[PDB]
Automatic annotation (TrEMBL):
Cofactor(s) this protein requires: FAD
Annotated compartments: Plastid, Chloroplast
Source organism of this protein record: Zea mays (Maize)
Pathway field: Energy metabolism; photosynthesis
Residue span(s) of domain FAD-binding FR-type: 24-152
EC numbers, comma separated: 1.18.1.2
Ubl conjugation keyword on record: no
Chief location: plastid
This protein's name: ferredoxin--NADP(+) reductase
Keywords for this protein: Chloroplast, Electron transport, FAD, Flavoprotein, NADP, Nucleotide-binding, Oxidoreductase, Photosynthesis, Plastid, Transit peptide, Transport
Length: 309
């Protein structure tokens, strides 16, 4: 059955925490664990980082933590590094179900010369490698939490939530789905439909697949899960299989759900949004509908939730 979580007082706040810690005085959190999420054929390393905040930096699902990596700002001598934001991949209780930890899902940014393929560690991403190189006991300067765009609308516990992720964009949805399905949260009993679409390069690049597959077996009437493996599958037009192509496969169901009030969420690569928009326009056209008019209504009705970069 559902996993006991504590403390229940994390359900009491009526508003999300915001900017509890600020860059000039971050919270010094401690790494609990860092593990790779991916297999040897993944094009890059993505890691799962568990951070002990001690209950000092609570958050709601869908929010981000800021991390200030060590060092000086290259563009401002004497200044600390800029905050990098990471979407929290855990529920407010965290992976130890105790309200003391939060988790990040971090892609290592690695630079390769476009011509030679030669790696250049000096051009790698500072914070992502800092995080995935961390070890238990290391300290992390945390700020935030921040963000409200991806907060989960809970007013209707039987709402439909269609979640579209590319890569580490799956982060908030891991938290949504644990709250919907895994954790014993007496004041939020989800009875709607949650539908996760996840795009990753190949099978070795899947993130949390065992967890999501378990929900299909535990909640077959409330959870659907579709994957687009870009380098293992091709779309109807001959391009790599992206999430927009999986959305197209279920266009009639998705449009009906949206017309019925479903929320739809997009997280991950900013580059996926033009492709999604093009696909949805084409689907609407085939149905004799205007996508522009539909999207305007979804935005007016607060059904459309995008956080990409
Ligand atoms: C709201 C929100 C939420 C999230 C994210 C963003 C935002 C806006 N991100 C992205 C994350 O904040 C961050 O931008 C990336 O982890 C990269 O940060 P680094 O400090 O690693 O790279 P850094 O900022 O140091 O560098 C940026 C890029 O420039 C490249 N670069 C550096 N020097 C170069 C040079 N001389 N020539 C060419 N290239 C060079 C680096 O390789 C890197 O790709 C994210 N990410 C994630 O993995 N998981 C998440 O959950 C989130 N969540
Ligand atoms: N809130 C936020 O803003 C937020 C939260 C989390 C993550 N992010 C960002 O989202 C990105 C996730 O990327 P990642 O490095 O984890 O994954 P990635 O491996 O670079 O890409 C994930 C999948 O998306 C595919 N893809 C590439 N271009 C696409 C397009 N135009 N449309 C649809 N799919 C496309 C990729 O296929 P190919 O590589 O085969 O083309 C891959 O299969 C990260 O850069 C991260 O910084 C942002
Ligand atoms: Mg795997």
């Amino acid at each position: 059955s559902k996993v006991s979580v504590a403390p229940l007082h994390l359900e009491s706040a009526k508003e999300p925490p915001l900017n509890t810690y600020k860059p000039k005085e971050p919270f010094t959190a401690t790494i609990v664990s860092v593990e790779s999420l991916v297999g040897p054929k993944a094009p890059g390393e993505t890691c799962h980082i568990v951070i002990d905040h001690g209950g000092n930096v609570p958050y709601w699902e869908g929010q981000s933590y800021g991390v200030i990596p060590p060092g000086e700002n290259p563009k401002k001598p004497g200044a600390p590094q800029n905050v990098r934001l990471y979407s929290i991949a855990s529920t407010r209780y965290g992976d130890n179900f105790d309200g003391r930890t939060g988790s990040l899902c971090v892609r290592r940014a690695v630079y390769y010369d476009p011509e030679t393929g030669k790696e250049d560690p000096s051009k790698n991403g500072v914070c992502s490698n800092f995080l995935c190189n961390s070890k238990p006991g290391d300290k992390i300067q945390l700020t935030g939490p921040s963000g409200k765009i991806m907060l989960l609308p809970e007013e209707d516990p039987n709402a439909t939530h269609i979640m579209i992720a590319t890569g580490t964009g799956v982060a908030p949805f891991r938290g949504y789905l644990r709250r919907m399905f895994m954790e014993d949260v007496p004041n939020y009993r989800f009875g709607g439909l949650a539908w996760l679409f996840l795009g990753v390069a190949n099978s070795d690049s899947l993130l949390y697949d065992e967890e999501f597959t378990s929900y299909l077996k535990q909640y077959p009437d409330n959870f659907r899960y579709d994957k687009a493996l870009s380098r293992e599958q091709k779309n109807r037009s001959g391009g790599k299989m992206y999430v927009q192509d999986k959305i197209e496969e279920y266009s009639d169901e998705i449009f009906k759900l949206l017309d019925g009030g479903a929320h739809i969420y997009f997280c991950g690569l900013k580059g996926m949004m033009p492709g999604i928009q093009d696909t949805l326009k084409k689907v609407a056209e085939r149905r004799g509908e205007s996508w522009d008019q539909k999207l305007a209504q979804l935005k007016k009705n607060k059904q459309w939730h995008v956080e990409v970069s």
